[PDB]
């Protein structure tokens, strides 16, 4: 079995994993205790006794959210020794999470993940969920990525990091952490999927029509995304696509490995009745800039590749017709050298809606894994924010006093600039 494991660092990672594994155990009829009153073998190391232990490694530098998950309904579900806890948070610092607490727990976390790996028969890849402005989600994430690249390298390292929103930054020092972790993860992450908080806020505003969206709903959407991604492994379909094929299909070059996710059937229960939810209309919807999970305009940039994951009662003829119609579209721009990248992940396992959720029962769902030129401007403005911070040397004292030098900040900034140069020369 081509089994895979997931990692959860930072409060974002822990909450996302909580919602994700909740959806997972809902999919296979797994009780919160861990038994089912094969398909689930990929993510659950079910023993002889009825305890389907998840292949999850939750790590945090503060015990708050991990204690919360140890208090919820899933405490007995997770293996107690899996949950690794620190004592003090990285406090918005890449410096702390990469030098001062990261290497003081990295031995324990690497031992745990190695024990999990030896438990697995056929290793498929790695899943990590974190943030960018998060101190843990930058420092610890980059340190773990480089460590795993050293340890394995040949395996599949997949990032589900969340993008810092273009207009709002909850952490005032987000650009520093983002730039440092991008610099230290560019050469150690096979493919890093992108999702933005502001974009999903707008989506749940205008599509879910919810006036009070909490982090729970964002985590529900992210769980739906990951379930669509992993359906081809956890279930059979007409064309099953594993994580290995993702790097072949998506990335043209080693550096350009930042696709953005998209989910078309994001309508609410009330609007479900007024629409038939046909394949063609949802396929068009997933190309709408307003439906993108990243705050950017895909209309402004050419596409590099499009990975489509379909689940439910879907017919390949309809998918072929929809993609043919999209090929004829004008606003949908593309580059010439790769004019045939539309790899499909058709499957016939309908998505399951969590009780008390905001999504509706939808027969067919599509997960658009777009890779396009529409992230170059986001990188440019992130680097501009970094330059604004660095020009007055504001907040530099903390980082130089807890693990690095401003020379390293210059290195990261110029590395991001070189990435922008490569991106723009590929775009033309």
């Amino acid at each position: 079995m081509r089994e895979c494991i997931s990692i959860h660092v930072g409060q974002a990672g822990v909450q996302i994993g909580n919602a994700c594994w909740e959806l997972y155990c809902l999919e296979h009829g797994i009780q919160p205790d861990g038994q089912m009153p094969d398909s689930f073998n990929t993510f659950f190391s079910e023993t002889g006794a009825g305890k389907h232990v998840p292949r999850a490694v939750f790590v945090d530098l503060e015990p708050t959210v991990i204690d919360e998950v140890r208090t919820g309904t899933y405490r007995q579900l997770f293996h107690p020794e899996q949950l690794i806890t620190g004592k003090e948070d990285a406090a918005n610092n890449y410096a702390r999470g990469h030098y001062t607490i990261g290497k003081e727990i990295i031995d324990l976390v690497l031992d745990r993940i190695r024990k999990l790996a030896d438990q697995c028969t056929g290793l498929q890849g790695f899943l990590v969920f974190h943030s960018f402005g998060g101190g843990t989600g930058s420092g610890f994430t980059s340190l773990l990525m480089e460590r795993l690249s050293v340890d394995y390298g040949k395996k599949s390292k997949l990032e589900f990091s969340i993008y810092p929103a273009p207009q709002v930054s909850t952490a005032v020092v987000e650009p520093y952490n983002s730039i440092l972790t991008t610099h230290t993860t560019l050469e150690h992450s096979d493919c890093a999927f992108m999702v933005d908080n502001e974009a999903i806020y707008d989506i749940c505003r205008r599509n879910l029509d919810i006036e009070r969206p909490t982090y729970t709903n964002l985590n529900r959407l992210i769980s739906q995304i990951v379930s669509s991604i992993t359906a081809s492994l956890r279930f059979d379909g007409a064309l099953n696509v594993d994580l290995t094929e993702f790097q072949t299909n998506l990335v043209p070059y080693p550096r350009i490995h930042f696709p953005l996710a998209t989910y078309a059937p994001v309508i609410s229960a009330e609007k479900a009745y007024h629409e038939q939810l046909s394949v063609a209309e949802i396929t068009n919807a997933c190309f709408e800039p307003a439906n993108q999970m990243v705050k950017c305009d895909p209309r402004h940039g050419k596409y590099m590749a499009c990975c489509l994951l379909y689940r439910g009662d879907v017919v390949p003829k309809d998918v072929n017709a929809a993609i043919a119609t999209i090929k004829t579209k004008r606003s949908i721009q593309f580059v010439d050298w790769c004019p045939t990248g539309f790899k499909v992940g058709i499957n016939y396992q309908p998505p399951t809606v969590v009780p008390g959720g905001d999504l509706a029962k939808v027969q067919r769902a599509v997960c658009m894994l777009s890779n396009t030129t529409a992230i170059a401007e986001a990188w440019a403005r992130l680097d501009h924010k970094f330059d604004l911070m660095y020009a007055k040397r504001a907040f530099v004292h903390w980082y130089v006093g807890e693990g690095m030098e401003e020379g390293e900040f210059s290195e990261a900034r110029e590395d991001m600039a070189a990435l922008e140069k490569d991106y723009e020369e590929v775009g033309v």
Binding site: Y99, T100, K103, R393, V396, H397, V400, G401, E402, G403, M404, E405, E406, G407, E408, S410, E411, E414, D415, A418
Partner: protein, 376 residues
């Protein structure tokens, strides 16, 4: 032949006494002229410094050893005497870092020895002879040549032995000018952001305090300030500091190569005839290694070691941009060296780099911010 000798030698008395007064009056004039003659060049020389500098950046690349020359070394390209280009041989580094060109005041060839450094000594001591607070900084990584140029070797002495020898013969000339110069030696160490004494083994409490005369004048309480009487006495003063500063430098890299030693020679020149007192100071200061903190055994203070370098980099940039406020008190090193960093004071900025490929990145960090000084 007795009575005639009375008149003749009385005439000789008038002939000599007239010559006594003739030579006395213009002896005062020539001494008066020499003071303004040295005062004219005093304001002429710093004008030369001001137009071309007053924050001078110099770079020296040390030569690889006979076995280290076969070791991989990044390509060194010298466009001229003021610009140096270093390129990483690795193709992947070329694609991302690209061309690394930097502009400085002067570039030192690995075969330049100490000749041109001694050529820089004469203008900088003249600024000290002008009673100016002049400071020099030895920046670079471990083994890049900071210790080879500051202290030196018996066959080719460093700046400190050369400065002392030239300073002593210089003040002998000014002793002919009626100037008596009192020179004070102060040795201190800045490790873990707390000051020590190099000349005393006793553990005393040190604190930075402004002098009674002026706020801009800074002293440290309970220091062992020694009055210098002769070169050999002064030479022994610096020699006494080396074994007191005995710690791992390359074998362990524990405290040395990560330390800030401040050697200040306060010169107090006085002229009894013209009641003029000239006050100056030189700061033979070497800087800590700017290597990235990887020694997790004591990585906490290495950040403070990096903090002093970072704050010092912040301070020098503030001077160039004409910033009204300069954060001198953010670090002990900057606060102590505030008199020699602001206003009419002049700073030599000496950076040491290593030609090997593994040190290319740390060399780049040294060059870019030093070149940023030249840009502004």
């Amino acid at each position: 032949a007795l009575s005639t000798e009375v008149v003749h030698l009385r005439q000789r008395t008038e002939e000599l006494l007239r010559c006594n007064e003739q030579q006395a009056a213009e002896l005062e004039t020539c001494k008066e002229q020499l003071f303004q003659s040295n005062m004219e060049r005093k304001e002429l020389h710093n004008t030369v410094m001001d137009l071309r500098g007053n924050i001078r950046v110099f770079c020296r690349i040390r030569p690889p050893l006979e076995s280290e020359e076969n070791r991989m070394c990044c390509t060194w390209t010298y466009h001229d005497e003021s610009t140096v280009e270093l390129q990483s041989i690795d193709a992947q580094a070329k694609s991302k870092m690209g061309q690394q060109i930097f502009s400085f005041d002067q570039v030192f060839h690995p075969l330049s020895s100490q000749s041109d450094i001694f050529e820089m000594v004469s203008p900088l001591i003249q600024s000290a002879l002008d009673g100016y607070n002049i400071c020099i900084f030895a920046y670079g990584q471990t083994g890049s040549g900071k210790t080879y140029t500051m202290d030196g070797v018996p066959e080719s002495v460093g700046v400190i032995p050369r400065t002392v020898d030239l300073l002593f013969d210089s003040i002998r000339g000014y002793r002919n000018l009626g100037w008596e110069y009192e020179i004070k030696a102060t040795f201190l160490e800045i490790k873990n952001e707390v000051l020590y004494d190099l000349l005393s083994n006793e553990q005393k409490d040190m604190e930075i305090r402004m002098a009674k005369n002026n706020k801009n004048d800074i002293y440290v309480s309970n220091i062992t300030e020694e009055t210098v009487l002769d070169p050999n006495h002064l030479r022994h003063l610096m020699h006494t500091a080396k074994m007191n500063r005995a710690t791992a430098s390359t074998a362990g890299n524990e405290r040395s190569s990560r330390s800030h030693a401040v050697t200040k020679l306060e010169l107090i020149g006085r002229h009894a005839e013209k009641q003029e007192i000239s006050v100056g100071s030189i700061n033979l200061v070497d800087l800590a290694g700017s290597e990235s903190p990887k020694t997790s055994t004591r990585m906490t203070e290495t950040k403070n070691i990096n903090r002093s370098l970072s704050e010092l980099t912040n301070v020098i940039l503030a001077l160039l941009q004409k910033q009204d406020h300069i954060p001198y008190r953010n670090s002990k090193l900057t606060h102590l060296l505030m008199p020699s960093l602001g206003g009419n004071s002049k700073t030599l900025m000496f950076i040491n780099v290593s030609p090997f490929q593994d040190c290319f990145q740390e060399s780049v960090k040294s060059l870019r911010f030093a070149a940023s000084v030249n840009s502004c």
